[PDB]
Design a protein around this nucleic acid. Structure first.
Length: 49
DNA sequence: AAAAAAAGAGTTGACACCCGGGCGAATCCCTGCTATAATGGGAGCTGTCACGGATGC
């Protein structure tokens, strides 16, 4: 989309966000984010950063 | 110089017949009635644009 939003449409139907189709499958919750973006650890407010 | 008849008309009975209207008979169309248990549906694009307009917050 022009707004940088992924839109999925099945059989040229009304456009809806791909997050709905992803949640329809087994992958739910933060599993869709853990598989797309990597996570980096950080300290729990130590000296400085 | 005269004077009556095959056609031309006109009918008068004498069949030949040809669809019409009935009498039949033979046969079509409608309608309903069947009693174990039946319980939500199958394609179709999706390889043209572009314009010109109609809804919505």
């Amino acid at each position: 989309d022009a707004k940088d939003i992924v839109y999925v449409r099945i059989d040229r139907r009304r456009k809806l966000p791909a997050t709905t189709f992803l949640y329809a499958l087994g992958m739910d919750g933060e599993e869709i984010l853990t598989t797309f973006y990597d996570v980096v650890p950080f300290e729990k407010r130590s000296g400085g950063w």
